[PDB]
Structure formats: C-alpha cells, structure tokens
Structure 1
Amino acid sequence: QCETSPCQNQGKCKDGLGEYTCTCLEGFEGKNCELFTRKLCSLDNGDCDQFCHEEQNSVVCSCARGYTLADNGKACIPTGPYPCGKQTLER
C-alpha cells in the first residue's frame, strides 16, 4: 500500500497488508504526517496538560507546583497524593 506513497512530507512508509504505516519525521502528525505539529497554544493548548506558552515559534508545556512535566513534555505528573486542582474522587 506504500506504492501510492501515502506518507506526506517525506514520511516513513512501512508496508504490511491491506494497510501501511507512516512514521512521521520532524513537525508532522496524522495518519500520513499531513497535520502540523503543535506550534501554537491556541490550537489544543499545544497538547499541554496544563500551562502553554511559545518558545522560539514552538510550543513549550509546563505544570503547576506539585506536578512534574512528563518525558513527552506535555503531561503533568503529580509529585504527591493531593496535587492542586484535582478533585478528591476516592469513593
């Protein structure tokens, strides 16, 4: 299925059966790497779990005290059992 060259923006097409797979390069998302990676906070909060600001025409996520920015650089990991802003839904 890679014959048709379905991966856009020089995507890494990997053939299989009735399907194919695209491994997106730098700055691309979507089944075919056709969507533009998070460059602004106005669109999806830049994929950030909490705070978002732009550094060098690029999105940079951050979190509130009591959280740590995950390795993916989007999510926020609680450092304790009672981080701010989380409802205590225990029962």
Structure 2
Amino acid sequence: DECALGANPCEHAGKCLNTLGSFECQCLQGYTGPRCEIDVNECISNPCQNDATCLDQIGEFQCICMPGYEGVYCEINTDECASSPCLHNGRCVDKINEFLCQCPKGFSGHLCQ
C-alpha cells in the first residue's frame, strides 16, 4: 500500500507504517509530529537544578552544571572532602567547588602537610 509508493514520508529515518487508504509515521526517539519533521525539545521538563543550563540534543537532554555541582540533573553538591584530602588529622570543610583544611598547630600548606 502506501509505503511501497517510492520515497519515504518519514523524514528522520522514521519507519513508514501503512494504515488503510493511508499511513502513519513511527518516529525514532526524539522526534514528533505527523511525519517526524520536528525535533522534540527534551528540555521542556526543566530536569536540571542549581542554575544549570539545559542542552536539547537529538533524543536526549544534556546539562552543564554550575561549578561544584554534578550529576545528570546537576542535583549533587560535590563533597570535595570525599577523597579525605587534609592529611595528618586535619579537619575538612566543604564549600562549593572549593575545600578548606583547618590546620592544627604545627602544620601548614594547602593540605596541611
């Protein structure tokens, strides 16, 4: 029927499906509309937090986090003290893309070393 009639009405590599006396387009992920000619905006749901920036890609969304934040939705404030940085029983103070080591007396330097 409709699909064998030459070219492809579904534009972005979508599959042609024959209805009766007509057809419908099986759109690949990230495409909508009758004949898949429109790029779906994957960033409508505003998935990412912490003042990030959403990038609408083909079939998926990508977010650039503000410095110090991470995760797919930029939902995680990175514990910069996770690696146990301050040595010799120093104290660790996490902030944002930044960490400070409280230095006990007799020790100095960035890592209190």
TM-score (norm 1): 0.46
| Structure possessing the higher radius of gyration over alpha carbons | 2
TM-score (norm 2): 0.38
